[PDB]
Design a protein around this ligand. Sequence first.
Ligand SMILES: [Mg+2]
Length: 330
Amino acid sequence: ARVREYSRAELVIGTLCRVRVYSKRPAAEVHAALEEVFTLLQQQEMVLSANRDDSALAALNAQAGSAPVVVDRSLYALLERALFFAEKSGGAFNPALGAVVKLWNIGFDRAAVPDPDALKEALTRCDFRQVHLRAGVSVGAPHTVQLAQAGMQLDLGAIAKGFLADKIVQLLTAHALDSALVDLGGNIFALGLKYGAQRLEWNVGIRDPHGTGQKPALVVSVRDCSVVTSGAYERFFERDGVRYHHIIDPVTGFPAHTDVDSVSIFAPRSTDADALATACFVLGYEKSCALLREFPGVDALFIFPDKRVRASAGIVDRVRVLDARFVLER
Ligand SMILES: [Mg+2]
């Protein structure tokens, strides 16, 4: 039986999602799996989206400062994980930052920075500790979420792609696929090994933080690993000479000022990589290193504004510089 390579890509969840698969299974089986991948991505846009009126998350937010709302097991589990990372990161990653994000989101659409007072007011409504998750223990008991703080709003944008990537990996596995590369707007999951009959690690590129992105600065070889990168270039606007990027510091309510240009997190679960990449950007290098010691099975790669690159022990030997302006410190 012969190995075939397949790819499919669509615009969905606000970005380009592409899955590449190598498989010796009948083509019709791979096609079936890919059909389901992209159906899942469509259905989940309608669960998780913070910027759509129809979604289950928007309906949940419409009940801030009221009674508990029943949610499916999957959303509950995602929120649990998000609150865990909010606690561990000291609020650097915060899934209850919707009131602030919403102000900045109109800012982007308008090319305008939000009013100082409006932001300070929004920051009174971002206490993730007031998100109460409860699940009864009895057979078939429902899962519920209560937003106890008035006008608090969830925004799962900084963890949602990792959640979906992990869900897609579970689906691929359920379809007896064990070799794939999932790319959801740049959040990568490398499932298994690729083919050359020889089996090889997937080679994932990391962009120059200040480059068009067309070519990678560095490449890392990985198996069964997510690679998620946070940088100021993912989304920003400019007004009066200043760039305002999308990664908000929850202490200031403004885009984070940090000592790294990008951080890339390598983890067994993309959900974890996504949350950590966001926290780490906000935290900066030294505080990140401290946080990451609490997650032994995770690795990281930092690109500094002076083009120095530092990578943790788990992956440093798997990093290759492609753009010689960058230096890998060992
Ligand atoms: Mg993130």
